[PDB]
Write an enzyme that holds these catalytic residues in place. Structure first.
Site, PDB file in Angstrom:
ATOM      1  N   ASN A 214      -8.868   5.053   3.342  1.00 22.08           N
ATOM      2  CA  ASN A 214      -9.408   6.059   2.239  1.00 22.08           C
ATOM      3  C   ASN A 214     -10.324   6.876   3.108  1.00 22.08           C
ATOM      4  O   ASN A 214     -11.008   6.468   3.946  1.00 22.08           O
ATOM      5  CB  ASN A 214     -10.318   5.118   1.314  1.00 22.08           C
ATOM      6  CG  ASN A 214     -10.794   5.582   0.310  1.00 22.08           C
ATOM      7  OD1 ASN A 214     -11.257   4.845  -0.633  1.00 22.08           O
ATOM      8  ND2 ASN A 214     -11.420   6.679   0.311  1.00 22.08           N
TER       9      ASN A 214
ATOM     10  N   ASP B 155      -6.233   8.134  -0.400  1.00 22.06           N
ATOM     11  CA  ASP B 155      -5.801   7.059   0.546  1.00 22.06           C
ATOM     12  C   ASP B 155      -4.665   7.709   1.357  1.00 22.06           C
ATOM     13  O   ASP B 155      -4.059   8.299   0.675  1.00 22.06           O
ATOM     14  CB  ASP B 155      -5.574   5.779  -0.321  1.00 22.06           C
ATOM     15  CG  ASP B 155      -6.540   5.152  -0.916  1.00 22.06           C
ATOM     16  OD1 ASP B 155      -7.768   5.257  -0.542  1.00 22.06           O
ATOM     17  OD2 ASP B 155      -6.328   4.513  -1.927  1.00 22.06           O
TER      18      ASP B 155
ATOM     19  N   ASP C 289     -12.845   8.445  -7.655  1.00 18.43           N
ATOM     20  CA  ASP C 289     -13.872   9.097  -7.224  1.00 18.43           C
ATOM     21  C   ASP C 289     -13.910  10.180  -6.516  1.00 18.43           C
ATOM     22  O   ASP C 289     -14.568  10.850  -5.937  1.00 18.43           O
ATOM     23  CB  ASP C 289     -14.776   7.835  -6.669  1.00 18.43           C
ATOM     24  CG  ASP C 289     -14.082   7.782  -5.250  1.00 18.43           C
ATOM     25  OD1 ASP C 289     -13.052   8.007  -4.643  1.00 18.43           O
ATOM     26  OD2 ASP C 289     -14.802   6.925  -4.344  1.00 18.43           O
TER      27      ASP C 289
ATOM     28  N   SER D 200     -12.034  10.465  -3.588  1.00 20.48           N
ATOM     29  CA  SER D 200     -11.450  10.140  -2.346  1.00 20.48           C
ATOM     30  C   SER D 200      -9.895   9.974  -2.350  1.00 20.48           C
ATOM     31  O   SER D 200      -9.450   9.907  -3.581  1.00 20.48           O
ATOM     32  CB  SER D 200     -12.244   8.891  -1.959  1.00 20.48           C
ATOM     33  OG  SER D 200     -11.732   7.747  -2.757  1.00 20.48           O
TER      34      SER D 200
ATOM     35  N   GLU E 253       0.699  -1.288   0.071  1.00 22.01           N
ATOM     36  CA  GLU E 253      -0.041  -0.136  -0.017  1.00 22.01           C
ATOM     37  C   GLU E 253       0.989   1.693  -0.135  1.00 22.01           C
ATOM     38  O   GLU E 253       0.548   2.147  -0.733  1.00 22.01           O
ATOM     39  CB  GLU E 253      -1.007  -0.074   1.432  1.00 22.01           C
ATOM     40  CG  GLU E 253      -2.137  -1.030   1.212  1.00 22.01           C
ATOM     41  CD  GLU E 253      -3.115  -0.765   0.390  1.00 22.01           C
ATOM     42  OE1 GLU E 253      -3.047   0.038  -0.472  1.00 22.01           O
ATOM     43  OE2 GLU E 253      -4.134  -1.596   0.045  1.00 22.01           O
TER      44      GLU E 253
ATOM     45  N   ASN F 252      -7.892   8.634  -5.551  1.00 22.72           N
ATOM     46  CA  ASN F 252      -8.930   7.616  -6.080  1.00 22.72           C
ATOM     47  C   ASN F 252      -9.754   8.333  -7.352  1.00 22.72           C
ATOM     48  O   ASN F 252     -10.160   9.483  -7.286  1.00 22.72           O
ATOM     49  CB  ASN F 252      -9.694   6.925  -4.932  1.00 22.72           C
ATOM     50  CG  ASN F 252      -8.828   6.161  -3.993  1.00 22.72           C
ATOM     51  OD1 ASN F 252      -8.039   5.479  -4.368  1.00 22.72           O
ATOM     52  ND2 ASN F 252      -9.249   6.338  -2.604  1.00 22.72           N
TER      53      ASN F 252
END
Ligand SMILES: [Cl-]
Ligand SMILES: [Cl-]
Ligand code: NA
Length: 129
Positions: free
Chosen positions: A59, A52, A48, A50, A35, A46
């Site tokens: 998220n 992380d 959309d 959002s 990650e 991301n």
């Protein structure tokens, strides 16, 4: 902060992640490797909208507030920036709520695709724990 492998394994163990919800420590280390490459300052946007954050790429869609993710929740009750600290407490505490959310570690898509079903014990082999 960029952790060394064994240093993060020790920190994760101290914060209660070894066998948390049944996931041995090497699963947590493997997820963090893929990650964030063990970097608490990692962020990734991301599609959309959002973002992380942190060592476990938590998220903003559901877990933390960053003031710029329309219609999202803050289930961990924390500003997302707290997940970037050299002190991993918030990332660990919020990951405990996520992995307790019904889907286990499948919540982390990298864990599912790169750690699940592999020899994850290799990630802590050699470490003083
Ligand atoms: Cl928001
Ligand atoms: Cl599970
Ligand atoms: Na949010």
């Amino acid at each position: 902060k960029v952790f060394g492998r064994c240093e993060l394994a020790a920190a994760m163990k101290r914060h209660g992640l070894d066998n948390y919800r049944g996931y041995s420590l090497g699963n947590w280390v493997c997820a963090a490797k893929f990650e964030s490459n063990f970097n608490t300052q990692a962020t990734n946007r991301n599609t959309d909208g959002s973002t992380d954050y942190g060592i476990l790429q938590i998220n903003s869609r559901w877990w933390c507030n960053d003031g710029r993710t329309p219609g999202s929740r803050n289930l961990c009750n924390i500003p997302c920036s707290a997940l970037l600290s050299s002190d991993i407490t918030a990332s660990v505490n919020c990951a405990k709520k996520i992995v307790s959310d019904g889907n286990g570690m499948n919540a982390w898509v990298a864990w599912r695709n790169r750690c699940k079903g592999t020899d994850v014990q290799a990630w802590i082999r050699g470490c003083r724990l």
